[PDB]
Amino acid sequence: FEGGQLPLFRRLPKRGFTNINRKEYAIVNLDQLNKFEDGTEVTPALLVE
Amino acid sequence: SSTKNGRDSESKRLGAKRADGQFVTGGSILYRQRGTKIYPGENVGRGGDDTLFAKIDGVVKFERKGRDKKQVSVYAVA
Amino acid sequence: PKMKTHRGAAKRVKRTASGQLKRSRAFTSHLFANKSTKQKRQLRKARLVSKSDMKRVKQLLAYK
RNA sequence: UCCUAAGGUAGCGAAAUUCCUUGUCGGGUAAGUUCCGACCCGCACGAAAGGCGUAACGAUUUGGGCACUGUCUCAACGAGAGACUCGGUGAAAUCAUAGUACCUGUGAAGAUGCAGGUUACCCGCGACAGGACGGAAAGACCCCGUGGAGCUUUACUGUAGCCUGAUAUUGAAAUUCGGCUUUCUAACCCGCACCACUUAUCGUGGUGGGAGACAGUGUCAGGCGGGCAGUUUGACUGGGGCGGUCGCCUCCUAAAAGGUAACGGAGGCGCUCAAAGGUUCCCUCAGAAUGGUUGGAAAUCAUUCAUAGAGUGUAAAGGCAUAAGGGAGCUUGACUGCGAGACCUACAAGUCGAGCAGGGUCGAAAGACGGACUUAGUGAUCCGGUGGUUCCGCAUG
RNA sequence: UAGGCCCAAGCGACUGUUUAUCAAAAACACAGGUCUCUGCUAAACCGUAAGGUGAUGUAUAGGGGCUGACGCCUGCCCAGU
RNA sequence: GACAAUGGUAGGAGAGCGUUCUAAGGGCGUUGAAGCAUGAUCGUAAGGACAUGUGGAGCGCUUAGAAGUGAGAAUGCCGGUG
RNA sequence: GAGGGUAGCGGAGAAAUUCCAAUCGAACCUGGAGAUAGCUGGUUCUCUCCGAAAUAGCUUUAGGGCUAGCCUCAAGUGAUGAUUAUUGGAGGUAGAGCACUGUUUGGACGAGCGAAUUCAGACAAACUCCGAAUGCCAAUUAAUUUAACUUGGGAGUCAGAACAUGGGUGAUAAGGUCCGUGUUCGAAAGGGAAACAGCCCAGACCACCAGCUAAGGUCCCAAAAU
RNA sequence: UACAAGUAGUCAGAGCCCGUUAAUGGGUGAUGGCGUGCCUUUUGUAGAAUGAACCGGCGAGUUACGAUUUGAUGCAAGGUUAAGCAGUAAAUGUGGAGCCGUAGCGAAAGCGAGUCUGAAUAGGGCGUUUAGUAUUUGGUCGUAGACCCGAAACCAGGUGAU
């Protein structure tokens, strides 16, 4: 409440929308792959455990 | 039993903005005015509404330009 | 119970990586014949919520 | 001589009505702002929210008399009940603590309590009522609250109720330039009659008569609807109303930076221009001590004085003859994508801007050009409309 | 123990009625007058259903508005609602 | 052992006193506990001891924990008495 | 007189907002219910350090609220703070003046001769050929000094008053009213002005039967020169 | 203590009567100097502005779920479980659905230490600064009556014509 003056959010306009088929991924940089053995096989099933 | 007056407009902040001998940048406003009461000098430009601004970096210099006329210039610091 | 989010405010700002909020501009719906070209061109750029308005609507966006 | 649907008739009239006003002139009194009788200059009488009269009635209003009287001049005495003195019994409002004087002054502007003076031995009883802004009731008048309640209406939005069509209940026959109307019994209706339940006519049933596809009833639709209901009806203001004012631009008050008030002193704006814009080259104004085809000295032409006293779309103030003022040629930069750095500033907004890339116009070329000499001509968002498009579109296309 | 009276005006005709507890009056009522609605399962009214009042009445009747005994009278306009 | 600081309302910051209950440890009481009354006592403040009379069965101390934790005003509520 | 009928979105009323169990412009009891109150009143132990505001902008806003400005507590970045001397600049007030725009006194000269000619003398917030004293912005210039700025936690304040001084308004009236600047009160005891928040001197950590001074004073009340 | 003008006290001080938690003692007070109660509300109150006759008792920022900031503590590119199950209503052991962090940018498709805008890394915006997480003491805010007391009124269901 601003005491009677129009609030900032009322003054500003809305923008954008949302997508129902939003796909997100779990990022893994090349820095977190320095612990496995040389030549090993890395698979998502292993990275999660 | 009434008044016919009571109107006025908002005050504009005219006048000089930087002092003589002061260091400024390339786009610093130096003088706001109506018309041309002070003329531009070396390395100075006149805006659309008669505003005077610099174009390089240096010291400000308010000097006289003829009988009853003034200018403003900017010189690079060495 | 948990605090409720201001749904009207969640449709007008976004949270940046440093904790700031990005907003839109005003005077952009209509009456473009009364504004200059430079005036309208520079209004398409976004801004951030000022440091004074954040003190008033901090808790309004505590879950965003 | 203007206007209107028509321009007040009889009667009455300084009145329960007359503001000026104690209108003026006659009665009543030694003296009459009242009273009675007449005059019409009726602010603002008037014929059924009737006009003008009227005998008898009135704990009705009004003026003048007779009689009478302590109402009064002007007070006196007497009787009884309280008061007052003893025995018995024995409350109440009020209350920060109190050993509680006056005068002039001072103070939040009217002092028992402060200053300087004056006066006053300690403690009772019967009386008076000036002051302790005395005591009984969170002042009813006045102003405030985006506080209540009752009432009103051609305030807003609704509603009981009433009126009118479509359709269901609901079937026949004929007239007729997917049909309003005469027409018939079988639905439906009858606080109509006679019978039975039953020596009660509330009700049911049966037989006659009346009416009849109407009425009544359900759903949908249109109109009327202070009858009833929920609510709104701004602020500033030398108290509040009434009057005026509310945003933006320029000047003065404003005290040589900027900023700065009053219901202080003066004006303007809610546009305009396709050339009144850009560019290149040229040019220069009012007023013109005199001459003239001699027209109430100033339209037009001619020569010298000419420190700008002219102009600059539109108010004012700062600017402009190195022109920003006038004219003549070609043009659309009144462009697209931006943008270091600054002014202003509570926020949202507002203002100036070098420079870089893509197109161009004018000029021989440097170079200028992102509207107009500068500062007013304008209004979030939410919702809806019209175009274009990289994008999303609920299992898939 | 038991009416003062009289000469003149305003208002309402009259007896009557009214703010329990600051107003008894010129206010209300009244007899009379006029307009208007209602042909009977009447209009109007309560419930707004059944059932009732009106009325065990039938226009010489019933409901509503305005005037207010009696006497003499009650003029002009229908553009608007 | 030296110089320098310390008036204060609305407010911000810091360190403390007292009251009831709980957990551990260590102690008083019929050779007289709590409460109450009186006094010429101690600390910078809120407060803490001691002696005497009354009283007749419970109550301190130390560290920590938890709160119905502090009264002169509200024309405040109840009781008593002017 | 006795026995009965009409009930609150309702009754009754020969009509007064009249009556419905001693207050009826809408009866009484219980419940929703701790309705709501931007308005009054109240709000309980002790010390230490620091210490305001009564302003601006917007407001169905004016005795309310919000951001900014002044206070306090922490974590940070380092002369970036303040005064003075000096050298520089921007800006037309006081005064003055009549060269522009006005207003206006007395003469002289014939174009119709006191204000678009000349010789003298005056006037102005919205006149200026001229123009201070101060104040303001600067120079990592010099000396003396102690701040300033950024981020975050918590606030209060939006009724101000008198005196001096520059102005408007009123009447060169008001303990009047509205702005600029400084001081005091507010939130400040002590001494002086007889008494007297705002005037003059001066800022109370505690104790003492010690000394020197300020304003103002020294015949008596009453400390100090008859 | 009966010649006296008093918010009743404080400082100075004879006389008279006493003798304690033992020390720079206790009670009374001739006379002199100074001094107009308390609270609330205000620019400003001895105020003739508000409140209290007196004494005692009672009588007003609390708690549960969320958010944020600071102190403490364990672990650390990781940190931590909720319901449930077994247990003394113990607070331990199990339980890894789930939540936060390690990577941003854009309305979105998407790309990625880069991304968006744009014809153009030309310029500019926000990021690459990048330590976190769980429990808990304190301060403040939000939803609940929300520091306490007090309305004129509104609606619902009932009781009344002695």
SS3 of B3-59: CCCCCCCCCCCCEECCCCCCEECCCCEEEECCCCCCEECCCEEECCCCCEEECCCEE
Sorted by where each begins, the domain ranges of chain C are: 1-64
Q: Are B59 and B74 in contact (CB under 8 A)?
A: yes
CA proximity to B37, closest of B14, B59, B4: B14
Q: How far is the CA of B68 from the C1' of D326 (A)?
A: 28
Q: Are A7 and C26 in contact (CB under 8 A)?
A: no
What token pair was written down for A12?
């500003």
The whole-angstrom distance between residue A19's C-alpha and the CA centroid of its chain comes to 14
What token pair was written down for B38?
């002070």
Query: CA–CA separation, A47 vs A5, rounded Å?
Result: 55
Q: How far is the CA of B59 from the C1' of G85 (A)?
A: 24
State the structure-solving technique. cryo-EM
Q: Long-range contacts for A30-35 (Cβ within 8 Å, ≥24 apart)?
A: none
What token pair was written down for A7?
């609030």
Q: Which residue of C has its CA nearest to A17?
A: C11
Q: Specify the resolution in Å.
A: 2.9
B41 contact partners, CB below 8 Å, separation of at least 6: B61, B63, B65, B71, B72, B73, B74
Indicate the residue type of B19.
A
Neighbours of B42 (CB within 10 A): 14
Query: CA–CA separation, B45 vs B74, rounded Å?
Result: 11
Query: CA–CA separation, A38 vs C25, rounded Å?
Result: 54
Query: CA–CA separation, C60 vs C53, rounded Å?
Result: 12
Query: CA–CA separation, C49 vs C14, rounded Å?
Result: 10
Which whole-number Å values give the CA distances from B64 to A31, B38, B55, in the listed order?
67, 9, 20
What token pair was written down for C22?
């990005």
Indicate the residue type of A41.
E
Nearest nucleotide from residue C52 CA, by C1' atom: G67
Q: Are C20 and C13 in contact (CB under 8 A)?
A: no
* Residues forming a β-bridge with B61: B73
What token pair was written down for B31?
């003088």
Query: CA–CA separation, C22 vs C48, rounded Å?
Result: 5
CA proximity to B66, closest of B30, B39, B35, B31: B39
Nearest to C24 among A2, A10, A15 (CB): A15
Nearest to C23 among A2, A10, A12 (CB): A12
What token pair was written down for C18?
């440093």
